[PDB]
């Protein structure tokens, strides 16, 4: 618990931890900062997101290595170790989801913060769904879908089609459709419509905003190239 460290110090240390590539530390500092109870600024939300995407990204890559070895194998060691990594990953996803539920989402009133947190909620339920096999796997998938859908509804009402958070949300929801929901046609249609509506709005942007939006558009096009 980071309860004895100042909020501003936790934020400063999270930035240092990023520079040092100490992502577990970075996540613990940002968890501490959230638990101070104040809303997060745009920059602080990004730090929270980057910390946990790196932590869970390493766990997911490890889980995929071990899952592949285990599939080829079919002693208990490979399964046991895959299970250990899986439980650790589930614990990190549950931690992030807990921060969003207590109480980041309910205090997020602006569209930019609310969309950001709901996209996170969809992503972390998606990572749970990647490893799920039991009685609640359908419910996990629906929890991801519901979070992404609420984020999409807000983003289409409140943000321009080139907004980078709106674009990244659509990208990740399209990956959800393709990889989790077994809806490749929905994934392709979402990615295409998102790309085209962004293209048509680029003329409104400054040079710096243009760079930000076109970077994510390229990720949409990369997926469309792979899927079609």
């Amino acid at each position: 618990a980071m309860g004895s460290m100042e909020r501003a110090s936790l934020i400063q240390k999270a930035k240092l931890a990023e520079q040092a590539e100490r992502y577990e530390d970075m996540a613990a500092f940002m968890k501490g900062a959230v638990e101070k109870g104040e809303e997060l600024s745009c920059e602080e939300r990004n730090l929270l997101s980057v910390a946990y995407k790196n932590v869970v990204g390493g766990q997911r890559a490890a889980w995929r290595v071990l899952s592949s070895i285990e599939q080829k194998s079919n002693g208990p060691e490979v399964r046991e170790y895959r299970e250990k990594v899986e439980t650790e990953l589930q614990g990190v996803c549950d931690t992030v989801l807990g921060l969003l539920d207590s109480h980041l989402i309910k205090e997020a009133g602006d569209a930019e913060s609310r969309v950001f947190y709901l996209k996170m909620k969809g992503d972390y339920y998606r990572y749970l769904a990647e490893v799920a096999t039991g009685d609640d796997k359908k419910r996990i998938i629906d929890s991801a879908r519901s979070a992404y859908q609420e984020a999409m509804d807000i983003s289409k009402k409140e943000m321009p089609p080139t907004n980078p958070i709106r674009l990244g949300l659509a990208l990740n929801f399209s990956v959800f459709h393709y990889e989790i929901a077994n809806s490749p046609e929905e994934a392709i249609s979402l990615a295409k419509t998102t790309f085209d509506e962004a293209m048509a709005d680029l003329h409104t942007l400054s040079e710096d905003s243009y760079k930000d939006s076109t970077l994510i558009m390229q990720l949409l096009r990369d997926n469309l190239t792979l899927w079609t």
């Binding site: 980057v50 995407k53 990204g57 994510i216 997926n223």
Partner: peptide, 8 residues
Amino acid sequence: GSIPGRRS
């Protein structure tokens, strides 16, 4: 690929 999201 999803958003890499690994660098602030």
